[PDB]
């Protein structure tokens, strides 16, 4: 099985850590906080890592059956968390958390949805605090908490299927900071993480990480004063499904890709997609100034010692 | 270039008319209302039709720059609302061509209902903003007019002072209204894209199986319902001809059709065999030799292409 990458242009593709179109290409330096994404992790061989799911609608979310408090103004909701396919989450399995679980610290605003109940369907505005400031973000233990904002009393009875779907993160002066590079405590304050997908840092000199950018919406209680935000991922969802389906064996540490712009009738730049599923370019940190209507094309397998032409 | 379909299991794939995982397979009969979807339209050769976009996050939504009004019980709750006016554009940010080959901008909602969601103003230098919102796509609202280059978004209960012109906005769908005396959600009913005054144009063609004993196979998802926190409205579904992963697969592949339909087999790894077979017609829909109603098969199986066949090929019953 010969290797290949999707022929879709970048602005057609989507973020694998957040529900959004890709609208930017940026190069990140080797900052103190190392990239440790749990979502959007796929090898060139199509091996999924961390909490990565192929179900785009399950990304950065929680779903499962409601349960009572004792079994574990606003209204609290308790879920026994499960996988996107509906099968139960394996506590002592090979994952730090259920697939699609948020992989960063913030207060995440969104909707709590109870779609199938015979007594009638329900939804309400909700938020999930994934910072260590909240003791009850514990999806690694099999249960987690969701807060229904301003209402929801009488609707959180046990035995019903719920979903939390993300809309935005909180911003503003006295709200918890949104830190997309900061991994949460999946097991809460009392316990440790396990089976995390490995850190991403370029080994070779002169090679920096290339990230796919999206806008990150911000909630500030209707003020409209909080500063605009971004969120990033190693590979687009369309890349991940392509590789997973293909299951092509890696023939070298990296695949040399060229970014091809039909209008310009030429290649604009080239990059290295490493076996571990991240891209690098010989370029300094910061936003790349290229049109997003170009696509990546695979040309050959190269070693880690291959010297890229500057961007 | 040989034809093929994705090897992904069904419960891994997503709906091309709504933001949701696929969780059902159902067979629809030839009802009075013919399937006329504008989103989720792709031929087996990878030709996109209607308002179909490859950007899954732009599906059933509206985006563009804000504009002034001059540029363009129920009554009580309405007074508390704020209207937002957008000059609609494509997902890539390029302007909508009013006299182009589309009934509306790509990703526009293709059914009549009140759609609840979020109005997002994500990049403004003065600070980012969002608010709870709804879009009335029924002929009951004169101002759903995306075909004309402008449409309306209603901010529920607030938003005054935030709807100034010149800023980038998005409307993203969360649910449809379902309350007792609220507009009906009718996923098979095409909206008036130009409003009451003008007619639609360049609609993707109707879908109805020609061959006898063949009914349409649809991919089902849950549809969330908003009823102002009552929780009494009955549960809903939404359907599509092909999953998003099918559409991107065909678009990238660009394989020429060698016959009227592609014979697909549904393969279940645990059972170690094919469970049923179907026909994927060139026009981009699937059919099966089966009566109407929900199919009872596990969703951890995948479709596999076996050969090109004519419309007269007789499928084995499901």
Residues 6+ apart with CB under 8 A from A165: A57, A61, A110, A111, A113, B174
Domain B59-183 is of which CATH architecture?
Answer: Beta Barrel (2.40)
Q: How big is chain B by its Cα radius of gyration, in Å?
A: 21
| Residues in chain A closer than 8 A to B132 (CB atoms) | 125
SS3 call for A58: helix
Which is it for the CA torsion B247, B241, B13, B175, positive or negative? Answer: positive
Element (H, E) at A220: none
| Residues in chain A closer than 8 A to B230 (CB atoms) | 120
CB atoms B127 and A86 under 8 Å: no
CB atoms A226 and B128 under 8 Å: yes
Domain B1-58+184-318 is of which CATH architecture?
Answer: Beta Barrel (2.40)
Domain boundaries, chain A: 1-58+177-311, 59-176
Q: Pick from B130, B159, B300: which is nearest to A168 by CB?
A: B130
- Give the Cα separation of B16 and B52 in Å (integer): 8
CB atoms A217 and B120 under 8 Å: yes
- Give the Cα separation of A99 and A89 in Å (integer): 9
Q: Distance of CA B206 to CAs A122, A304, B43, B49, Å?
A: 33, 53, 13, 12
Q: Distance of CA A61 to CAs A58, A160, A223, B7, B12, Å?
A: 6, 17, 26, 25, 15
Burial of residue A203 (number of CB atoms within 10 Å: 0-12, 13-18, 19+):
exposed
Distance from CA of A206 to the nearest CA of B (A): 32
CB atoms B235 and A116 under 8 Å: yes
Experimental determination technique = X-ray
| Residues in chain A closer than 8 A to B224 (CB atoms) | 111, 113, 115, 121, 123
Q: Pick from A7, A11, A57: which is nearest to B20 by CB?
A: A57
| Three-state SS letters, A6-22 | CCCCHHHCECCCCCCEC
For the beta carbon of residue B104, count every other beta carbon within 10 angstroms.
28
Structure tokens at B308: 């090109």
Q: How big is chain A by its Cα radius of gyration, in Å?
A: 20
CB atoms A123 and B92 under 8 Å: no
Assess contact for B108 and B89: CB atoms under 8 A: no
Structure tokens at A48: 């999924």
Distance from CA of B154 to the nearest CA of A (A): 15
CB atoms A115 and B224 under 8 Å: yes
- Give the Cα separation of B153 and B211 in Å (integer): 43
Assess contact for B62 and B167: CB atoms under 8 A: no
- Residue by residue, DSSP assigns A40-56 as S-B-TT--B-TT--S-G
Distance from CA of A50 to the nearest CA of B (A): 17
- Closest chain A residue to the Cα of B20, Cα to Cα: A57
Chains A–B, number of C-beta pairs less than 8 Å apart: 161
- Give the Cα separation of B118 and B128 in Å (integer): 13
On the CB side of A291, how many CA atoms lie within 13 Å of its CA?
A: 15
Structure tokens at B314: 């007789």
Residues 6+ apart with CB under 8 A from B243: B6, B10, B13, B14, B15, B16, B22, B219
User: What are the phi and psi torsion angles at A107 (to 5°)?
Assistant: -100, 120
Distance from CA of A284 to the nearest CA of B (A): 25
| Domain B1-58+184-318 and domain B59-183 have a common topology | no
- Closest chain B residue to the Cα of A8, Cα to Cα: B252
Structure tokens at B87: 């000059």
SS3 call for B11: helix
User: In a mutagenesis test of the A interface, which of B130, B132, B244, B303 is the best target, namely the one with the most A β-carbons within 10 Å?
Assistant: B130
Report which of B220, B214, B237, B219 is spatially closest to residue B291, judged by C-alpha positions.
Answer: B214
Distance from CA of B144 to the nearest CA of A (A): 24
Q: Distance of CA A292 to CAs A23, A68, A265, Å?
A: 7, 48, 15
CB atoms B251 and A8 under 8 Å: yes
Q: Pick from A14, A54, A165: which is nearest to B56 by CB?
A: A14
Report which of B315, B300, B246 is spatially closest to residue B268, judged by C-alpha positions.
Answer: B300
Burial of residue A238 (number of CB atoms within 10 Å: 0-12, 13-18, 19+):
buried
| Overall residue count recorded for chain B in this entry | 318
CB atoms A167 and B162 under 8 Å: no
Assess contact for A104 and A184: CB atoms under 8 A: yes
- Residue by residue, DSSP assigns B134-156 as EEE-STT-TT--GGGTEEEEEES
- Give the Cα separation of A87 and B12 in Å (integer): 13
User: What are the phi and psi torsion angles at B271 (to 5°)?
Assistant: -75, -15
- Give the Cα separation of A208 and B104 in Å (integer): 41
**Which class does domain A1-58+177-311 fall in?**
mainly beta
Distance from CA of A94 to the nearest CA of B (A): 19
CB atoms B14 and A57 under 8 Å: yes
Burial of residue B212 (number of CB atoms within 10 Å: 0-12, 13-18, 19+):
exposed
Strands A161-170 and A218-219: parallel
Assess contact for A234 and A278: CB atoms under 8 A: yes
- Closest chain B residue to the Cα of A165, Cα to Cα: B174
- Closest chain A residue to the Cα of B172, Cα to Cα: A167
Across chain A, the runs of DSSP E, i.e. the strands, are 24-28, 62-67, 75-81, 107-114, 122-129, 143-148, 161-170, 208-216, 218-219, 229-233, 254-261, 266-274, 279-281, 286-287, 295-302
Please list the residues that pair with B60 across neighbouring strands: none
Q: Does CATH number 2.40.170.20 belong to domain A59-176?
A: no
Assess contact for A223 and B127: CB atoms under 8 A: yes
Distance from CA of B51 to the nearest CA of A (A): 14
Estimate the share of chain B in helix, then strand, then coil, as percent rounded to the nearest 5.
10, 35, 60
Assess contact for B251 and B48: CB atoms under 8 A: yes
Report which of A166, A150, A157, A135 is spatially closest to residue A63, judged by C-alpha positions.
Answer: A166
- Residue by residue, DSSP assigns B215-228 as EEEEEEEEE-EEST
Place of tokens 């103003």: B121
Assess contact for B139 and B74: CB atoms under 8 A: no
- Let me know the angle formed at the C-alpha of B24 by B20 and B28, rounded to the nearest 5 degrees: 110
Strands B168-177 and B225-226: parallel
Q: Pick from B54, B127, B300: which is nearest to A224 by CB?
A: B127
| Residues in chain A closer than 8 A to B7 (CB atoms) | 245
Distance from CA of B196 to the nearest CA of A (A): 32
Assess contact for B10 and B302: CB atoms under 8 A: yes
Q: Pick from A53, A119, A121: which is nearest to B224 by CB?
A: A121
Distance from CA of A19 to the nearest CA of B (A): 6
CB atoms A58 and B178 under 8 Å: no
Assess contact for B50 and B103: CB atoms under 8 A: yes
SS3 call for B114: strand
Q: Pick from A14, A228, A245: which is nearest to B128 by CB?
A: A228
Assess contact for A7 and B252: CB atoms under 8 A: yes
- Give the Cα separation of A162 and A113 in Å (integer): 5
Structure tokens at A213: 């950018």
User: In a mutagenesis test of the B interface, which of A56, A171, A237 is the best target, namely the one with the most B β-carbons within 10 Å?
Assistant: A56
CA distance between the termini of chain A:
30
Burial of residue A130 (number of CB atoms within 10 Å: 0-12, 13-18, 19+):
buried
Q: What is the dihedral of CA A68, A71, A72, A77, to 10 degrees?
A: -10
- Give the Cα separation of A63 and A69 in Å (integer): 17
CB atoms A8 and B162 under 8 Å: no
Angle between helix axes B244-253 and A237-246 (nearest 10 degrees) is: 80
């Amino acid at each position: 099985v010969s290797f290949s990458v999707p022929g879709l242009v970048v602005e057609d593709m989507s973020n694998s850590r957040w529900p959004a179109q890709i609208n930017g290409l940026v190069v990140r330096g080797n900052e103190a906080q190392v990239v440790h994404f749990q979502n959007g992790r796929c090898t060139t061989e199509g091996t999924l890592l961390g909490t990565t799911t192929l179900s785009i609608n399950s990304i950065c979310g929680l779903r499962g059956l409601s349960v009572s408090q004792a079994s574990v103004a606003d209204t609290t909701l308790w879920l026994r968390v499960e996988e996107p396919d509906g099968r139960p989450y394996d506590i002592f399995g090979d994952q730090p958390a259920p697939l699609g679980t948020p992989d960063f610290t913030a207060v995440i605003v969104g909707t709590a949805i109870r779609p199938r109940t015979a007594s009638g369907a329900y939804l309400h505005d909700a938020y999930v605090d994934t910072t260590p400031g909240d003791a009850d973000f514990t999806p690694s233990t099999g249960n987690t908490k969701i807060v229904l904002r301003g209402g929801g009393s009488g609707h959180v009875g046990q035995g019903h299927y719920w979903q939390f779907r993300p809309i935005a993160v909180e911003g503003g002066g006295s709200r918890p900071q949104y830190q997309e590079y900061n991994l949460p405590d999946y097991a809460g304050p009392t316990a440790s993480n396990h089976d995390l997908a490995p850190p991403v840092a370029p080994r070779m000199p002169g090679e920096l990480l290339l990230l796919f950018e999206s806008d990150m919406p911000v909630w500030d209680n209707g003020a409209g004063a909080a500063p605009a935000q971004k969120i990033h991922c190693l590979l687009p969802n369309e890349f991940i499904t392509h590789l997973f389906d293909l299951q092509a064996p890696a023939l070298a540490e990296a695949a040399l890709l060229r970014y091809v712009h039909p209008d310009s009738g030429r290649t604009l730049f080239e990059c290295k997609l490493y076996r571990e599923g991240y891209m690098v370019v010989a370029a300094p940190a910061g936003r790349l100034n290229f049109p997003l209507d170009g696509y990546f094309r695979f040309d050959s397998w190269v070693s880690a010692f291959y010297i890229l032409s500057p961007v």
